[PDB]
Design a protein around this motif. Structure first.
Motif, PDB file in Angstrom:
ATOM      1  N   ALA A 185       0.825  -1.207   0.000  1.00  0.00           N
ATOM      2  CA  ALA A 185       0.000   0.000   0.000  1.00  0.00           C
ATOM      3  C   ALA A 185       0.860   1.258   0.000  1.00  0.00           C
ATOM      4  N   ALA A 186       1.876   1.301   0.861  1.00  0.00           N
ATOM      5  CA  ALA A 186       2.722   2.487   0.914  1.00  0.00           C
ATOM      6  C   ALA A 186       3.468   2.697  -0.391  1.00  0.00           C
ATOM      7  N   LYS A 187       3.951   1.617  -1.018  1.00  0.00           N
ATOM      8  CA  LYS A 187       4.675   1.774  -2.272  1.00  0.00           C
ATOM      9  C   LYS A 187       3.800   2.468  -3.301  1.00  0.00           C
ATOM     10  N   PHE A 188       2.564   2.010  -3.454  1.00  0.00           N
ATOM     11  CA  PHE A 188       1.740   2.512  -4.542  1.00  0.00           C
ATOM     12  C   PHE A 188       0.944   3.755  -4.166  1.00  0.00           C
ATOM     13  N   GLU A 189       0.781   4.027  -2.868  1.00  0.00           N
ATOM     14  CA  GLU A 189       0.135   5.256  -2.425  1.00  0.00           C
ATOM     15  C   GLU A 189       1.088   6.452  -2.490  1.00  0.00           C
ATOM     16  N   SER A 190       2.322   6.306  -1.977  1.00  0.00           N
ATOM     17  CA  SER A 190       3.230   7.433  -1.748  1.00  0.00           C
ATOM     18  C   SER A 190       4.626   7.227  -2.325  1.00  0.00           C
ATOM     19  N   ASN A 191       4.881   6.098  -2.978  1.00  0.00           N
ATOM     20  CA  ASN A 191       6.240   5.700  -3.360  1.00  0.00           C
ATOM     21  C   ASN A 191       7.205   5.775  -2.175  1.00  0.00           C
ATOM     22  N   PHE A 192       6.712   5.417  -0.991  1.00  0.00           N
ATOM     23  CA  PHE A 192       7.502   5.353   0.243  1.00  0.00           C
ATOM     24  C   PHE A 192       7.957   6.734   0.752  1.00  0.00           C
ATOM     25  N   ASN A 193       7.362   7.837   0.275  1.00  0.00           N
ATOM     26  CA  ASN A 193       7.741   9.196   0.681  1.00  0.00           C
ATOM     27  C   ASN A 193       6.775   9.696   1.758  1.00  0.00           C
ATOM     28  N   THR A 194       7.316  10.030   2.927  1.00  0.00           N
ATOM     29  CA  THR A 194       6.476  10.510   4.016  1.00  0.00           C
ATOM     30  C   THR A 194       5.844  11.873   3.750  1.00  0.00           C
ATOM     31  N   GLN A 195       6.291  12.599   2.726  1.00  0.00           N
ATOM     32  CA  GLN A 195       5.776  13.938   2.441  1.00  0.00           C
ATOM     33  C   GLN A 195       4.874  14.013   1.214  1.00  0.00           C
ATOM     34  N   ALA A 196       4.517  12.883   0.614  1.00  0.00           N
ATOM     35  CA  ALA A 196       3.634  12.902  -0.539  1.00  0.00           C
ATOM     36  C   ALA A 196       2.302  13.544  -0.170  1.00  0.00           C
ATOM     37  N   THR A 197       1.797  14.390  -1.068  1.00  0.00           N
ATOM     38  CA  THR A 197       0.461  14.959  -0.935  1.00  0.00           C
ATOM     39  C   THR A 197      -0.205  14.989  -2.300  1.00  0.00           C
ATOM     40  N   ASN A 198      -1.532  14.818  -2.318  1.00  0.00           N
ATOM     41  CA  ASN A 198      -2.279  14.812  -3.578  1.00  0.00           C
ATOM     42  C   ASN A 198      -3.667  15.404  -3.370  1.00  0.00           C
ATOM     43  N   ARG A 199      -3.989  16.454  -4.124  1.00  0.00           N
ATOM     44  CA  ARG A 199      -5.281  17.126  -4.047  1.00  0.00           C
ATOM     45  C   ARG A 199      -6.345  16.376  -4.853  1.00  0.00           C
TER      46      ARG A 199
END
Ligand SMILES: [Cl-]
Length: 127
Positions: A31-45
């Motif tokens: 889930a983390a790989k495909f949600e955020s590419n493992f980046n704790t700062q990913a954001t998406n509007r």
């Protein structure tokens, strides 16, 4: 920060996600790989005015409060800004609430579409 695969698996295990509510650790890493590419700062509007935050892309309409989303419910009782920390505690604690709400990991669109039905334990192999 950007986690490595096994690095995040080990951290998620320390935080109690392995087998949590019926979901083995590989589900959470995938889930983390495909949600955020493992980046704790990913954001998406999103179209509804909400934003998804952090390593697990937690949504500001239902779960965290970002002060600019109509219809906010803040069911995790946490500011969305805390979910952009490099420490995964707040994201994990909210994820535990999300996955306990009655629809499993289906809250995570990337998990539903790209992890569910695959051999998710491959995501912890070798760790
Ligand atoms: Cl915020």
């Amino acid at each position: 920060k950007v986690f490595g695969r096994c690095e995040l698996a080990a951290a998620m295990k320390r935080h109690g996600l392995d087998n949590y509510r019926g979901y083995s650790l590989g589900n959470w890493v995938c889930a983390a790989k495909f949600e955020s590419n493992f980046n704790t700062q990913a954001t998406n509007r999103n179209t509804d005015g909400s934003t998804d935050y952090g390593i697990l892309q937690i949504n500001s309409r239902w779960w965290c409060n970002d002060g600019r989303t109509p219809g906010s419910r803040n069911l995790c009782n946490i500011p969305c800004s805390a979910l952009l920390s490099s420490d995964i505690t707040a994201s994990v604690n909210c994820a535990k609430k999300i996955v306990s709400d009655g629809n499993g990991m289906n809250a995570w669109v990337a998990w539903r579409n790209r992890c569910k039905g695959t051999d998710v334990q491959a995501w912890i192999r070798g760790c």
